[PDB]
Amino acid sequence: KERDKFYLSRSVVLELLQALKLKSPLPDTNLLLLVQFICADAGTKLAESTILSKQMIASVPGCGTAAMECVRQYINEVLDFMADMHTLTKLKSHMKTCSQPLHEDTFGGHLKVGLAQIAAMDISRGNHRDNKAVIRYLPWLYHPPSAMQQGPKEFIECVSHIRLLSWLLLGSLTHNAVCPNASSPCLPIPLDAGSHVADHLIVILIGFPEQSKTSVLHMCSLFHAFIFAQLWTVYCEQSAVATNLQNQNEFSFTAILTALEFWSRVTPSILQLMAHNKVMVEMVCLHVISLMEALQECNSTIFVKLIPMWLPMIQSNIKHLSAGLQLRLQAIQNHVNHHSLRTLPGSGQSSAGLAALRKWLQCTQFKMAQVEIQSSEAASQFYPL
Amino acid sequence: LPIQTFLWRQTSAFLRPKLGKQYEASCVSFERVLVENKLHGLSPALSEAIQSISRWELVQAALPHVLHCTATLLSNRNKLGHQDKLGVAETKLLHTLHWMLLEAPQDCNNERSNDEEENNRRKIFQNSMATVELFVFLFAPLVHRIKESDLTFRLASGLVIWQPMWEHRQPGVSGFTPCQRSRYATYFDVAVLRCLLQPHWSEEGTQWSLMYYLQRLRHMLELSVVLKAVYLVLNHDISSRICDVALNIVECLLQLGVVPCVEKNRKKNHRLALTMLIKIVKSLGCAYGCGEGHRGLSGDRLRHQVFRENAQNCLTKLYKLDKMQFRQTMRDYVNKDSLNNVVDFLHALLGFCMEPVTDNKAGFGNNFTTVDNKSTAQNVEGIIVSAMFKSLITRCASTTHELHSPENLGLYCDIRQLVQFIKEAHGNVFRRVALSALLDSAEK
């Protein structure tokens, strides 16, 4: 009987919806342990947390436990939790009933990714071939904000949209790090709409002269969304030579073409703002230098195809950068020239490459927790109403 | 910005999931500004920004744009059908490439002599090592696509670059230019290091790299990253003529003397060659024809010339290097591969599905005392079965619940002969692992 075939995948999730709405009496050692259940259904594990010790998650299996058609109807509270910005300073304003002080800020990232890893599985069954998943709840991916309609309401719409997509990309990146054995191809942002996901950054690009000095969120919008380009690059790396479909090389070719159309739609407005002013060369190429440093950290084959499409155009006015940015640019260029010998994939180097990629994923996910919590806190400082 | 908007428009249409009607309208605007420096018909912002930079800086800004254009056109030329007769626009584009790489050092000192010209070409090729990185990144699968008839005579100025794409000698470009200095990495060595990583290779490009390896060993004797680069083009769909010269190059690479000596380092490069040998012998069919693999004339003639005297000769020369660690390698081969591929490889080597046409006294090694025999162990079949039997028995003993079910029934016939072959032709190691427990707990 159906009430019993999905019985204990329903009794716990009614407290999960009220724990993610932050009203249940439960400690963080037992809060993520409830999300462990909905993650233990498809053979999956969550991200490495520091509020959980190394003796708690050492006895959890990944068996099929009837919790796959109980989260596709409760998938809208995932987008409700990750959609708004204000909940991450509300995490450290309700769960202060434990005496563990060193493990507070990083769970601000660990509860968004703990749902977004779950939202990377039921969407994929909707987004195998036809994409019936995202067109029912949040259809703005196929209907992008266009280039010449950028306003402040459109800015706070589009940066929340790109925060939704970057958190879902972080969830799928945790889903392809510890548990990369899913036969359902994880496609949150499909490449057929890849000509439209490039249009979601043109609003922040040309609107950034006019929508920057209102709050701190407006200022580091270019730091909330140019990590998203790195996440798109590593998602194209994980899905291009992927083992889910019959074709392995031409899918990689059209994934390379989609990544190149995204980069050539996001890059000329960055260079336009570079050519506008020379203090903008510092303020913008801080983000450009940090994203290419993350590209050096990940070492993707999309990055080496864009090495001479940036550096001869950037080094033509290299003397108008700031103090540390010149040293960082020369260090990244010398690491490129050193790693030009070291740009060749094999059969055993990708294991240590993905170990470094998941340690970097945990590090920059803690860094996204710090960036989002600082941005929300000093934006509530800028908006003390 | 202005040249970086015009060429960005001429480049971004090629970098797309679909290619519109601008693939012919872009190569007209490439031999305009670069080949004969015509500035007419286009945007006047390009005419403003061309006279603020040098003639070389236009090449330095335009080379990766039309390089990604040519790479996205040659990767699409396989489907549209211009593999023998080239179009006009791609002819113009390759003429732009051979102007800005070969004829641009000519007029770069004419628009604005051996040592001063060397300093001038060093000033020209200051930041060239990032663009010749992309020159060998965006032509490595595209070597055999441009046929010699497809190579037009408008490209006859650029023969001296592409005729060294088939023999791989030193060409006449300064970005591609005494035993110790060959070990010092020049621009040519780092360029061919940046070249061999691409997929989609075939007979002419692999023969090009292999003739390069032959010329480099002839220059050297008269490092595992190039072994992994050979491995990236020796795990793909391998053919007959390429595995010929590949077995010749592993013959020439085993004799270098960089052998992992485990008997002379205790007082203070091999496994990948073995899996290339295993994939070559497996992919060349079985030695009598029953099983998977390449079937036809080329699959059959290379088991009595190339498996028998280019693969088994390599393994007989490889066994004369070390005597200890080959068992670990073939043990890792057993626990890495499934049942049917091991069946195919050992039918390609032993030939076990047909019965042993011998007599009933195949017991010439069948004693504990006679391990010192070097008849079949110096042959390849005995040493390979000796290094795989001690792990395949532990495999089938850990997988007892997989074989004795009748669903492997026809394959259950195969092993019904196979270990019998190891009973018949290899009774030495059969009797050895038959009573190795006394060597395990009573040789103390």
Residue numbers in the entry:
A (entry chain B): 2251 to 2635
B (entry chain A): 20 to 131, 166 to 230, 320 to 364, 653 to 698, 785 to 960
Publication text:
After the affinity columns, the eluted NALCNGFP–FAM155A–UNC79FLAG–UNC80 complex was further stabilized by BS3 cross-linking before the size-exclusion chromatography. After 3D classification, the selected particles generated a final reconstruction at an overall resolution of 4.5 Å, which show discernable secondary structure features. Local refinement further improves the best cytosolic region containing UNC79 N-half and UNC80 C-half to 3.3 Å, enabling side chain assignment of this region. Despite moderate resolution of other areas, a reliable overall model of the channelosome can be built, facilitated by the NALCN–FAM155A subcomplex structure and the predicted structures of UNC79 and UNC80 by AlphaFold2. UNC79 and UNC80 form a heterodimeric supercoiled assembly that sits beneath NALCN near the voltage-sensing domain II (VSDII) side. UNC79 and UNC80 form extensive interactions through three interfaces: the N-interface (UNC79-N and UNC80-C), the M-interface (middle region of both UNC79 and UNC80), and the C-interface (UNC79-C and UNC80-N), with a total interface area of about 5000 Å2. The II–III linker of NALCN mediates the association between the NALCN–FAM155A subcomplex and the UNC79–UNC80 assembly. Notably, these interacting segments of II–III linker (Pro638–Arg669, Arg715–Arg737) were unresolved in the previous NALCN–FAM155A subcomplex structure and was only observed when UNC79 and UNC80 were associated. The interacting segments of the II–III linker mainly includes a loop (L1) and two helices (H1 and H2).
